[PDB]
């Protein structure tokens, strides 16, 4: 156990309704984090993809400098009920300028309205539209799945379809993402209060977003249950040292390194779930640095 870094431990020490009043109340979090540390400019543009389970809004990014000859999908997380293309905007601006990408932020539909699996197949259609886009961005077809959270989950499977779907995936990078519904690890055990994401709310996450319980033991909710992990896309797995999740990501890169897959595993240490999403923390930016230097590997 390394020191909580000192300005996560301040922030938790200065940490003090309706589903639409809880949704709100996430968005305005994620406004107060870019009033304190803007965003960096970037030319965006709107759009709608005709998915399977009906239209999904998203919206591209363009970098002032092209450099990477990838487009990325991320996928934003929010315990599949919360967030938006908006609350994420911090964290996309910064990886499209800094990897120099174009990036595709999915506003998937969210539970409990729609419930799993609607946004997997969501996921993976906007995913298969990129890789036919591609081409006339003057890019490379395959692309690069991104999500944090919840969204490194829809990431995860994505990534674990995408042969079977015919679907050319060049890399997947997973931030802090939940992977596996059914066990019980020790991160899960001992930071499950007191650091942001809590036991009680991936609990009621579950309730809204999975069908029956039975649902947890699905392969497209957990994909840390997957036997063959071989030939999937190279991975980066970010984790954060007091995160419940952080045991079952990490254990996730360690089987993914062991099928031969080109793995980064980066544990961030002092850090709590969210930290990607939080720009008061420098460590943010460390990593989307991390993210710009894994892809320069790719190619
Ligand atoms: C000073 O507190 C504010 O009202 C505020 C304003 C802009 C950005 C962030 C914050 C903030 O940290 O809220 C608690
Ligand atoms: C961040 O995502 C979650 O907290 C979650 C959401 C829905 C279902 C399950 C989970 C979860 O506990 O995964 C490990």
Same mark, same amino acid.
């Given at each position: 156990?390394?020191?909580?870094?000192?300005?996560?431990?301040?922030?938790?020490?200065?940490?003090?309704?309706?589903?639409?009043?809880?949704?709100?109340?996430?968005?305005?979090?994620?406004?107060?984090?870019?009033?304190?540390?803007?965003?960096?400019?970037?030319?965006?543009? @709107?759009?709608?993809?005709?998915?399977?389970?009906?239209?999904?809004?998203?919206?591209?990014?363009?970098?002032?400098?092209?450099?990477?000859?990838?487009?990325?999908?991320?996928?934003?997380?929010?315990?599949?009920?919360?967030?938006?293309?908006?609350?994420?905007?911090?964290?996309?601006?910064?990886?499209?300028?800094?990897?120099?990408?174009?990036?595709?932020?999915?506003?998937?539909?969210?539970?409990?309205?729609?419930?799993?699996?609607?946004?997997?197949?969501?996921?993976?259609?906007?995913?298969?539209?990129?890789?036919?886009?591609?081409?006339?961005?003057?890019?490379?077809?395959?692309?690069?799945?991104?999500?944090?959270?919840?969204?490194?989950?829809?990431?995860?499977?994505?990534?674990?379809?995408?042969?079977?779907?015919?679907?050319?995936?060049?890399?997947?990078?997973?931030?802090?993402?939940?992977?596996?519904?059914?066990?019980?690890?020790?991160?899960?055990?001992?930071?499950?209060?007191?650091?942001?994401?809590?036991?009680?709310?991936?609990?009621?996450?579950?309730?809204?977003?999975?069908?029956?319980?039975? @649902?947890?033991?699905?392969?497209?909710?957990?994909?840390?249950?997957?036997?063959?992990?071989?030939?999937?896309?190279?991975?980066?797995?970010?984790?954060?040292?007091?995160?419940?999740?952080?045991?079952?990501?990490?254990?996730?890169?360690?089987?993914?390194?062991?099928?031969?897959?080109?793995?980064?595993?980066?544990?961030?240490?002092?850090?709590?779930?969210?930290?990607?999403?939080?720009?008061?923390?420098?460590?943010?930016?460390?990593?989307?640095?991390?993210?710009?230097?894994?892809?320069?590997?790719?190619?």
């Amino acid at each position: 156990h390394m020191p909580l870094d000192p300005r996560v431990e301040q922030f938790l020490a200065q940490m003090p309704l309706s589903l639409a009043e809880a949704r709100q109340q996430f968005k305005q979090g994620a406004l107060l984090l870019d009033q304190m540390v803007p965003p960096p400019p970037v030319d965006t543009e @709107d759009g709608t993809v005709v998915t399977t389970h009906g239209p999904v809004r998203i919206r591209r990014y363009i970098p002032d400098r092209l450099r990477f000859s990838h487009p990325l999908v991320f996928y934003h997380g929010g315990g599949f009920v919360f967030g938006d293309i908006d609350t994420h905007h911090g964290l996309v601006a910064r990886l499209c300028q800094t990897v120099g990408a174009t990036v595709i932020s999915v506003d998937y539909s969210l539970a409990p309205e729609a419930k799993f699996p609607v946004p997997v197949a969501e996921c993976i259609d906007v995913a298969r539209w990129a890789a036919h886009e591609a081409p006339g961005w003057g890019l490379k077809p395959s692309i690069v799945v991104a999500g944090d959270s919840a969204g490194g989950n829809l990431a995860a499977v994505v990534s674990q379809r995408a042969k079977d779907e015919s679907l050319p995936i060049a890399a997947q990078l997973l931030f802090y993402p939940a992977l596996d519904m059914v066990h019980e690890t020790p991160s899960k055990r001992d930071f499950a209060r007191g650091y942001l994401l809590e036991a009680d709310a991936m609990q009621w996450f579950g309730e809204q977003y999975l069908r029956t319980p039975d @649902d947890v033991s699905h392969p497209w909710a957990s994909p840390a249950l997957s036997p063959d992990l071989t030939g999937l896309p190279p991975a980066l797995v970010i984790t954060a040292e007091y995160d419940p999740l952080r045991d079952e990501g990490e254990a996730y890169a360690e089987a993914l390194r062991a099928a031969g897959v080109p793995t980064e595993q980066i544990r961030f240490d002092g850090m709590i779930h969210g930290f990607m999403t939080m720009p008061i923390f420098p460590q943010m930016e460390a990593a989307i640095e991390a993210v710009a230097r894994f892809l320069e590997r790719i190619d």
